[PDB]
């Protein structure tokens, strides 16, 4: 149908159809009289997986022969989404499969919708891991994703009476055709025990054993025939476990609970034992695998020449003392040499700014669970603090601040401090964030070891986030400038010479309109709610958190509603305001915010005076596959975190790539985005970081804004009085209370500038041609935010490997 | 190589090799440089499964079009063993696969050994279910096996210091290629709740839901292209289950524990709630499936014309009140019509004689778990007892004896009484057993409804138990009389005209010798123990139970040892005595018997005066695939249960088919076996049933035998004094105590006749030609004990369907 989706050759189509029918018959054990659409999806999925297999085998063979330096991306989260369409895109198979399935009387798009998301992540950090795997394969890096195969991913969100209800994401119920169990590579992981000291050093004994069984998932690069591996570990009990009889067999589940469920918190540390077990489990099994692969290339001096281990936040920070344990206790290297190897191997990416997001594990937990690792940590700390003392003699406070061990009622290990000490590189995820790490959060560490601190600004894969989710936009771009941009996104700058081309202006606006019609129809069939597709699509999608300030958006929504009610016969630009995201099950305030959003919708969407001029929709179950639908349909991207709180953001980049304008603060990657596009093509508002600090010094008094802004006072009275909750008039008194007395994120401080900037957006939307010309300037300068750029920088400045765009043989 | 294993055509072999390599590449994602032998097995298993698929689809299609009466075999146990070789045999693929694999440089026999047994059964009852499925497919019956897919089957037995240790049978660790998950046919099963009575009858409400997910396994008939289905249910939690958050997800395991593990007791009732849940789970899910299939053929009068439900013991007896519940509460039939339908649909096979084997469920358990079923049971009982009263007016004792409800400290439901009341047929499993049911155990029920009681003598499939496990014997038979006997085992009578043919005598003895050499070598490689293969192979394999009298065998073994030590320079026929079997984990006495066996071995096998004349081997981990090796190697089959205690036995039949002579009591099917072969070709000894009764009436005094038999007294003193346990002299005092004061099974009463009969066996073994002529007379009259005969009788006399040997099209 469209060029970027590849060729549908007569021999390709014939062979796909034949293999589809072979899989339906032999693999699925169905004929066409009893086949459900689910069977059709599985037949297609198996048919496409078959095209991966030879490339996957030959790529793993190639790495054995060449023996390149190997990159191990350790993460507790991989937010992969669906695999079928992505696999088709990267193998140039999409049109051929479309044609093949069409000839069998099937709609491929309908079959694609049957696939479960692999929702093994919470949000940005997990999705970054996924984009990164794609980019590493596309740049021909010998890279391995290592994580946990959770039986239950991020929960499925249902809305019941406007409240979030959580249900279990049983994503493996029907089978995962993309994974391959590798039970032959099963490895023991140890827990508990105690440490004996002998003649020949320390010995970790009397441990409980849990087995780690790996599952391999292919990660195809973009049309280069490279297929890398994501290896996810599953927990299995050994067969002698607890071995009255029946109960011993049933208790096998205690050990297997390790890989049962993803912890569903965004930027919040919960110090639970099960979570610690997950962290050690992935680290122990992965390091044995890395070391085994290294011995099949005595001499651990070459280990950092052949191995790079990237730590995706502190969640796998135990890799550091585990590598030390293996090298010292098992391989019998002296401490100093082992430490040299460890520091040169490991690198740490920080994603965090809020102090409640930092992992600080109670010492009593580590003492019980990982007694040897605690000893190694203490030894690391002592030696580290001796360097600090020698560099800053007499600075006793610095010693206390920099310690890996925090004193207090409960002693804790600061895992971030551990990562900095034991890594040769520490990076933030956007320029402003990496600067904040150097200036404030890790200032002391920066002064000791300035050379460690880098920036690597985040990115997104333009395969999933453009070609896959927005084929129509990809095509019109490809008509003008060719297909090379898909793996070299900087080439989008060539679109700047089309900013005054009427045909291209018309095509860009037409694709957007088509995407809005398609998303409006999706809301009709799946959720039975009607939206005006001529309205401006004002979208805020991301996890629900106070720092992300969905509440600021709510205040604007209510402001528009009250303005309409005040002057009902005045023209306003119509809006559909869509807000979506999951709240962590324990985060009471996030759950109240969801309830406020749906309660606003209950008033606004049923007011006959409003009409189709304003609609508020809570998008249920926001996940990777919903982002693929809603982002291409958006006009306005809401990126409105309090300055200094969003480390980078990546949603922001997805929207920029797909033809939405951005309203946002100078936070995270918004700053770099505005810099690339020009500030005049960005709706910037609010306090800068420096303004937030000035406010903190003198003190944030929310009452002052309430006293001075009549429009704001009205909204607070409506919330307080039960205007949005007539049956329970005090329902939202916690939200009012927080805003007035305990707001860490200064919602009122940015209110006035936000509402005003929102008026400028509405004004620009009245002029479709100039709106679209500004959109083109955004898309045209989105190139920097390809994860290919990001990974090339990791590769050159941290891992010490050159990326390649050369194809392996087919 | 040999004719009964089928043709190895050039096109067959070429196509198998090509598909083996396709599966190795695409299915397993390996090349030949990294493939483990496990991969080779899986590639072969997938290659063979592909030949099942079209027949399986076409057979299920054929049953939809013809709409024959359907047989549902409900069992909590299916002891299937390995599937690969059986599938090859029944598809005539064995030689072609042998050739194909040989040309790829692989030994098929080595690959076969990698397959895990499906050990979803304890012993005879479970193995009967498996043989029956094979026979039902071979006789072209529209039959379905329904059970539970246990994650852990019968435990793997290890011997440690002569003691049994149990470990978990993690048979699904590497995947089961033979099953096909059918998540689309998932069904709810209810537990707990309470009963509301309304205008429109009873309503079972406030229940907990567990999902039943079916897995289908193909059951090929012998070369008829029929492939029937075994459907096993797995327990799954619903996604709203317990839905703080993390704990709710982890608690999903409580519901899924239902299908976790097989209860490992042989002829012993343990009234545990989890076991009751298993029984209801298989019954509820199966009956919904039966009813759904029946509605795709209002009118439940035709239900017994289209459905037969066979109850394999009382374990699925809840089918009776569940069928009533569905018909009365959900379909709104009146009670009497529903009961007519139920009785005509259901039939009950009894396997039991010992009172501790009968299921008697406490009323408080049923009250909590299945409150509606308890009501239905009470109503069934009341109406049943009104019939008894009217037929036997004034016989108050009969009412008490026949009640489904047993009075006592704890009130109980007798499930056997329920089965008799609610079934149109009740059968025992051998003639003597079925007579004992009529004369003693269910005498009262027989007097009420004589027409219900039948016999169906057990059998064994000669596919697995001859062609598969003893190809060499099958071949020499086939040289003389052709291949037709494999599905018409009565044809073995033609071998009686070869009883004086020297060539056939030599061939029969040669095959036996080859099998003994092969089994002797197996003990060498896998268990490092050396046996004289010129010795008589004296084998007792079966579960460890007091009633089976392994202890009687031990007494004989010790007798021979003491006779040798008394007169060391006298000739004795050499013996290897092999005893094998698992003890139930809680059965202390069974575990002591294992320990005694290995302790006898410790003395006997290391005495230099004994030499290779006597060896005692405990065969570890007795299971279906070990029976396939040891049974063809046996000379003497030990079937020595106290008369009246072994309902049938089936091991006995396996040995007779494979060229062993039998030493045994007139118990179970031994009686019919001796009758078929002639008593002169059988080593019969001991008390008959009538003799046991005479002993019980006057009282069993073990001391009397101890006082009168010097050889027995010596053995008891050796056990008591620590002769077999020098380090713990009192180790076996529980065994001595039981034998002397509390022996239910009268071991000493049969001792003298057993030892004497054992001397006659030794005498016949000195004359190889006459030994082999007697063997031929046994094999030649083993035809009756084909499960094909057994199933044809179930079919005609209980289910009302004609078996067919006509082939479906290929
Ligand atoms: O997703 C996260 N962070 C996001 O990372 C992306 C990618 O760099 C940034 O764009 C974004 O600004 C930032 O918020 C995240 C971080 C820590 C935990 C966590 C988990 C367990 C315990 C403690 C914290 C859970 C989630
Ligand atoms: O395997 C069994 N019985 C055997 O059945 C075969 C086939 O008919 C006969 O040849 C043999 O004589 C007889 O012993 C068996 C019966 C009940 C339970 C059981 C399970 C749970 C609770 C209570 C009893 C467990 C096992
Ligand atoms: C990109 C993405 C995120 C992260 O978005 P932010 O706006 O950076 O928080 C979260 N969830 C999903 C499903 C995504 O696709
Ligand atoms: C046939 C068989 C049995 C039953 O044997 P009995 O001698 O009748 O108890 C038990 N276990 C296995 C593995 C079998 O093959």
Q: Quick check: B236 and A175 CB within 8 A?
A: no
A209 touches chain B (CB under 8 A): no
Q: Smallest Cα–Cα separation from A171: which of A536, A502, A624?
A: A624
Query: Nominal resolution in Å?
Result: 2.4
Specify the residue with its C-alpha closest to ligand 4, atom 6: B651
* Phi then psi dihedrals of residue A166, to 5 deg: -100, 135
3-state secondary structure (DSSP) of residue A202: strand
Tokens of A105: 């009387």
Q: Which residues contact A784 (CB under 8 A, 6 or more apart)?
A: A457, A459, A490, A672, A676
- Looking at the CA of B644, which ligand is closest? 2
Number of Cα atoms under 13 Å in the Cβ half of residue A521: 6
Number of residues written out for chain B: 810
> How far is ligand 3, taken at its centre, from the CA of residue A650, in Å?
6
Count of Cβ atoms closer than 10 Å to residue B397 Cβ: 10
Q: Quick check: B170 and A239 CB within 8 A?
A: yes
Best residue of A116, A164, A239 to probe chain B, by most B CBs closer than 10 Å: A239
Instruction: Give the whole-angstrom CA distance, residue B261 versus residue B168.
Output: 9
Q: Which residues contact A560 (CB under 8 A, 6 or more apart)?
A: A572, A575, A614
Element (H, E) at A41: helix A37-66
Nearest 10 degrees: Cα torsion A613, A618, A621, A623: 60
Q: Which residues contact B60 (CB under 8 A, 6 or more apart)?
A: B229
**CB pairs A-B closer than 8 Å:** 107
Q: Which residue has the tokens 């090796």?
A: B629
Could you tell me which chain A residue has the CA closest to the CA of B155? A245
* Phi then psi dihedrals of residue B606, to 5 deg: -115, 5
Count of Cβ atoms closer than 10 Å to residue A568 Cβ: 13
Instruction: Give the whole-angstrom CA distance, residue B309 versus residue B348.
Output: 9
Burial level of B481, CB count in 10 A (0-12/13-18/19+)? middle
Pairing of strands A346-349, A426-428: parallel
Q: Mutate which of B459, B463, B651 to test ligand 4's pocket (most atoms within 8 Å of Cβ)?
A: B651
* Phi then psi dihedrals of residue B216, to 5 deg: -100, 130
Pairing of strands A453-455, B307-312: unpaired
Instruction: Give the whole-angstrom CA distance, residue A283 versus residue A273.
Output: 15
Instruction: Give the whole-angstrom CA distance, residue A15 versus residue A21.
Output: 10
How far the first Cα of chain B sits from its last, in Å, is 25
Q: Smallest Cα–Cα separation from B805: which of B138, B228, B60?
A: B138
Q: Kindly report the nearest CA distance between residue B169 and chain A, in angstroms.
A: 8
Q: Quick check: B249 and A180 CB within 8 A?
A: no
Tokens of B424: 């149109």
Closest partner residue to A181 (CB to CB) among B61, B175, B239 is B175
All domains of chain B in start order, with CATH: 1-459+787-810 (3.40.50.2000), 460-786 (3.40.50.2000)
What is the set of active-site residues of B?
351, 542-543, 548, 650, 654
Q: What technique determined this structure?
A: X-ray
Instruction: Give the whole-angstrom CA distance, residue B180 versus residue B231.
Output: 9
B272 touches chain A (CB under 8 A): yes
Regarding the beta carbon of A264 and ligand 1, being less than 6 Å apart is answered no
Q: Where are the alpha helices (DSSP H) in B528-659?
A: 550-566, 588-604, 624-633, 651-657
CA B441 to chain centre: 23
A650 with A460: CB under 8 angstroms?
Answer: yes
At how many degrees (to 10) do helices A550-566 and A710-721 cross? 100
Pairing of strands A70-74, A307-312: parallel
* Phi then psi dihedrals of residue A607, to 5 deg: -80, 115
Instruction: Give the whole-angstrom CA distance, residue B326 versus residue B291.
Output: 9
Regarding the beta carbon of B650 and ligand 4, being less than 6 Å apart is answered yes
Regarding the beta carbon of B275 and ligand 2, being less than 6 Å apart is answered no
Tokens of B534: 């010129």
Instruction: Give the whole-angstrom CA distance, residue B651 versus residue B631.
Output: 9
Instruction: Give the whole-angstrom CA distance, residue A188 versus residue A110.
Output: 42
Phi-psi region of A718 (alpha: psi -120 to 50; beta: other; left: phi over 0): alpha
B57 touches chain A (CB under 8 A): yes
Q: Which residues contact B584 (CB under 8 A, 6 or more apart)?
A: B264, B265, B266, B268, B543, B590
Specify the residue with its C-alpha closest to ligand 4, atom 1: B651
Element (H, E) at A249: helix A245-250
Which residues from A are below 8 Å from B54, CB to CB? 25
Taking the alpha carbons of B253, B256, B258, B260 in that order, is the dihedral positive or negative? negative
Instruction: Give the whole-angstrom CA distance, residue A60 versus residue A56.
Output: 6
Tokens of B49: 């499964």
What does each C-alpha distance from B373 to B43, B74, B102, B310 come to in angstroms?
47, 19, 58, 20
Q: Which residues 143-202 in chain A show a CB within 8 A of chain B?
A: 152, 155-156, 165-168, 170, 173-175, 180-181, 183-184
Best residue of A150, A153, A245 to probe chain B, by most B CBs closer than 10 Å: A245
Residue numbers followed by a gap, chain B, C–N over 2.5 Å: 243, 297
A369 with A277: CB under 8 angstroms?
Answer: yes
* Phi then psi dihedrals of residue A145, to 5 deg: -85, 130
| Apex B402 CA angle, B399 and B408, nearest 5 | 85
CA A412 to chain centre: 28
What is the set of active-site residues of A?
351, 542-543, 548, 650, 654
> How far is ligand 4, taken at its centre, from the CA of residue B465, in Å?
12
> How far is ligand 4, taken at its centre, from the CA of residue B89, in Å?
22
Percent composition of chain A: helix, strand, coil (DSSP 3-state, to 5) = 55, 15, 30
How far the first Cα of chain A sits from its last, in Å, is 25
Element (H, E) at B204: strand B201-220
Regarding the beta carbon of A267 and ligand 1, being less than 6 Å apart is answered yes
Q: Mutate which of A78, A79, A468 to test ligand 3's pocket (most atoms within 8 Å of Cβ)?
A: A79
Element (H, E) at B205: strand B201-220
3-class SS string, B575-607 = EEEEEECCCCCCCHHHHHHHHHHHHHHHHHCCC
Count of Cβ atoms closer than 10 Å to residue B439 Cβ: 11
3-class SS string, B17-81 = HHHHHHHHHHHCCCCCCCCCHHHHHHHHHHHHHHHHHHHHHHHHHHHHHHCCCEEEEECCCEEEE
B165 with B158: CB under 8 angstroms?
Answer: yes
Instruction: Give the whole-angstrom CA distance, residue B754 versus residue B716.
Output: 17
């Amino acid at each position: 149908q469209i060029s970027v989706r590849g060729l549908a050759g007569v021999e390709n189509v014939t062979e796909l159809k034949k293999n589809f029918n072979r899989h339906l018959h032999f693999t699925l054990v169905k004929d066409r009289n009893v086949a459900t659409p689910r069977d059709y999806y599985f037949a297609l999925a198996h048919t496409v997986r078959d095209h991966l297999v030879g490339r996957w085998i030959r790529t793993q063979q190639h790495y054995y022969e060449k023996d390149p330096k190997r990159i191990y991306y350790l993460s507790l989260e991989f937010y992969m989404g669906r695999t079928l369409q992505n696999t088709m895109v990267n193998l140039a198979l999409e049109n051929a499969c479309d044609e093949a399935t069409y000839q069998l009387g099937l709609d491929m798009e309908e079959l694609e919708e049957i696939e479960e998301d692999a929702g093994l992540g919470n949000g940005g950090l997990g999705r970054l891991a996924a984009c990164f795997l794609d980019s590493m394969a596309t740049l021909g890096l010998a890279a391995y994703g290592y994580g946990i195969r959770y039986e239950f991913g991020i929960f499925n969100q249902k809305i019941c009476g406007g409240w979030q209800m959580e249900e279990a994401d049983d994503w493996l119920r029907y089978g995962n055709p993309w994974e391959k169990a590798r039970p032959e590579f099963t490895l023991p992981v140890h827990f508990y025990g105690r440490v004996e000291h002998t003649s020949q050093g320390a010995k970790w004994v009397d441990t409980q054993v849990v087995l780690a069984m790996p599952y391999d998932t292919p990660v195809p690069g973009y049309r280069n025939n490279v297929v890398n591996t994501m290896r996810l570990w599953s927990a299995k009990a050994p067969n002698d476990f607890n071995l009255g009889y029946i109960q011993a067999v049933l208790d096998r589940n205690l050990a297997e609970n390790i890989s049962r469920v993803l912890y569903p918190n965004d930027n919040f540390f919960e110090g639970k034992e099960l979570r610690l077990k997950q962290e050690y489990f992935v680290v122990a099994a992965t390091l044995q695998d890395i070391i085994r692969r290294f011995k099949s290339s005595t001499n651990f001096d070459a280990f950092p020449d052949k191995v790079a281990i990237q730590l995706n936040d502190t969640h796998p920070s135990l890799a550091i003392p585990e590598l030390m344990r293996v090298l010292v206790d098992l391989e019998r290297l002296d401490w100093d040499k082992a430490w040299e190897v460890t520091v040169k191997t490991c690198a740490y990416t920080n994603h965090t700014v809020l102090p409640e997001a930092l992992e600080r594990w109670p010492v009593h937990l580590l003492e019980t669970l990982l007694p040897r690792h605690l000893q190694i940590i203490y030894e690391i700390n002592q030696r580290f603090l001796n360097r600090v003392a020698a560099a800053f003699p007499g600075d006793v406070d610095r010693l206390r601040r920099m310690s890996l061990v925090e004193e207090g009622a409960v002693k804790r290990i600061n895992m971030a401090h551990l990562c900095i000490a034991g890594s040769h590189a520490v990076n933030g995820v956007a320029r402003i964030h990496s600067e904040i790490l150097k200036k404030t959060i890790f200032k002391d560490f920066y002064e000791l070891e300035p050379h460690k601190f880098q920036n690597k600004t985040n990115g997104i894969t333009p395969r999933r986030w453009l070609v896959l989710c927005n084929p129509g936009l990809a095509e019109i771009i490809a008509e003008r400038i060719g297909e090379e941009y898909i793996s070299d996104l900087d080439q989008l700058r060539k679109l700047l010479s089309y900013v005054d081309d009427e045909a291209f202006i018309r095509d860009v606006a037409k694709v957007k309109q088509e995407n809005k019609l398609k998303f409006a129809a999706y809301l009709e069939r799946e959720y039975k709610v009607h939206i005006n597709p001529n309205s401006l699509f004002d979208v805020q999608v991301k996890r629900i958190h106070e720092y992300k300030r969905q509440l600021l958006n709510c205040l604007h929504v209510i402001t528009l509603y009250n303005r309409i009610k005040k002057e009902p016969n005045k023209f306003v630009v119509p809006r559909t305001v869509m807000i979506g995201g999951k709240a962590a099950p324990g985060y009471h305030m996030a759950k109240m915010i969801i309830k406020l959003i749906t309660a606003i919708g209950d008033v606004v969407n049923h007011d006959p005076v409003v009409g189709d001029r304003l609609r508020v929709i809570f998008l249920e179950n926001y996940r990777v596959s919903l982002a693929e639908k809603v982002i291409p349909a958006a006009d306005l991207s809401e990126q409105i975190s309090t300055a200094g709180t969003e480390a980078s953001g990546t949603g922001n980049m997805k929207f920029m790539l797909n033809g939405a304008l951005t309203i946002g603060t100078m936070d995270g990657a918004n700053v770099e985005m505005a810099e690339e596009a020009g500030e005049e093509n960005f709706f910037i508002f609010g306090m800068r970081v420096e303004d937030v600090d000035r406010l903190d010094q003198r003190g944030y008094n929310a009452q002052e804004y309430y006293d001075r802004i009549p429009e704001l006072r009205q909204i607070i009275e409506q919330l307080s009085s039960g205007f949005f909750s007539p049956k329970q008039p005090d329902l939202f008194k916690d939200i009012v209370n927080m805003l007035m007395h305990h707001d860490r994120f200064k919602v009122f401080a940015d209110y006035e500038e936000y509402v005003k900037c929102q008026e400028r957006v509405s004004a620009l939307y009245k002029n479709p041609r100039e709106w679209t010309r500004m959109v083109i300037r955004n898309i045209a300068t989105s190139g920097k935010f390809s994860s290919d750029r990001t990974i090339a920088q990791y590769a050159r400045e941290i891992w010490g490997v050159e990326p390649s765009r050369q194809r392996l043989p087919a």
